[PDB]
Amino acid sequence: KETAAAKFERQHMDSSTSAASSSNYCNQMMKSRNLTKDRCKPVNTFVHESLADVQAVCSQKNVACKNGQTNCYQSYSTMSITDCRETGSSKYPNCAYKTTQANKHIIVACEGNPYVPVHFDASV
C-alpha cells in the first residue's frame, strides 16, 4: 500500500520541471501518475518545487483547511504550480484537461512523524 505522503508525491509533485511544458502537459502527467484509471479526477495541481522545500510548508503558516481541519499550511512563498482542470469532452476512458501554469501560494495538509504533506488543499 502506497503511503499517504507517497501518494501525495505521486499526485502533486513534478520537481523535474520548473513549470508546464505544452498544454498537453496535464494530459501527459495526469495519466502518467494514474489519475485517469477508474477515476477521472476533476482537477489536480502540480507543484514544481523540490520536495525538500514543499515539506517545508508544514512548518509555515498554520491555516485552516478548506474542509474545517486545523492541520493545513500556507506557503510563506509563491510556488509555480500547474493546475489541470477536467475539460467537458474528457470522457473516461480518454480524459482531457486544461493546463494552467501559475506562481501562487499552496496550502497543504500535514501529518505524521515526520510532518509532511499528505493532502494538497488549495492555492492562493
Added chain:
DNA sequence: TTTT
C-alpha cells in the same frame, strides 16, 4: 470522488 471535493485534491487527507
